[PDB]
Each structure stands twice: as C-alpha cells, then as structure tokens.
C-alpha cells in the first residue's frame, strides 16, 4: 500500500501552486487580450470620421 501510494496520490503542495499559476496566467491572458482588442480603433482615430 505504501509503494502504490508513492505512484498515485498527487502531491497537493505542488498541485495548489500549479493551480494558482494557471489562474494567474488565465487572468493575465484575458486582460492582455482585451487590451490588444483595444488597439485597432486607432485606425478610426486616424480616419477622423
């Protein structure tokens, strides 16, 4: 049982860190995606109409 547990039973300490990293990447990616989508209308600003 000890031996099998050493293969299964994911280490939660690393799992929580990976989960927090994934959440941070998701939030940053969404924010930068919105900011990138806020770029194009400079062409409308150029066109002055």
């Amino acid at each position: 049982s000890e031996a099998q547990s050493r293969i299964q039973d994911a280490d939660y300490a690393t799992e929580v860190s990976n989960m927090s990293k994934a959440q941070i990447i998701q939030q940053a990616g969404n924010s930068v995606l919105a900011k990138a989508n806020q770029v194009p209308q400079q062409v409308l600003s150029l066109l002055q109409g």
Partner: protein
C-alpha cells in the same frame, strides 16, 4: 536543455522512491524470517536437554 534536465531529475526522483519502497518490502520479509529463525533457535535450545 534546462527543461530536459529538470524533467529527467524528476523522473529519477520517482524511480528512487520506487526503489525505496521495494527495499522496505524486502526488509519486512527478512525481519519476519528473522523472527521465525529466532523461534527455531529457541526450540533447539529447549531440545538439547536429556
């Protein structure tokens, strides 16, 4: 190169843990065999009296 290295060391650590587990199983088996042999020696010491 660093990614390859870190992955290799992680897999090596898991392999070492597996080896520790197999050694533990063997040690338990040998320990109880030792208990049986000690009991046999007990019996032998008992049986020497005339």
């Amino acid at each position: 190169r660093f990614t390859s290295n870190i992955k290799g060391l992680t897999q090596a650590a898991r392999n070492a843990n597996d080896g520790i587990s197999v050694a533990q199983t063997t040690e338990g088996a040998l320990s109880e065999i030792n208990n049986n042999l000690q009991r046999i020696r007990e019996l032998t010491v008992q049986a020497s009296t005339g």
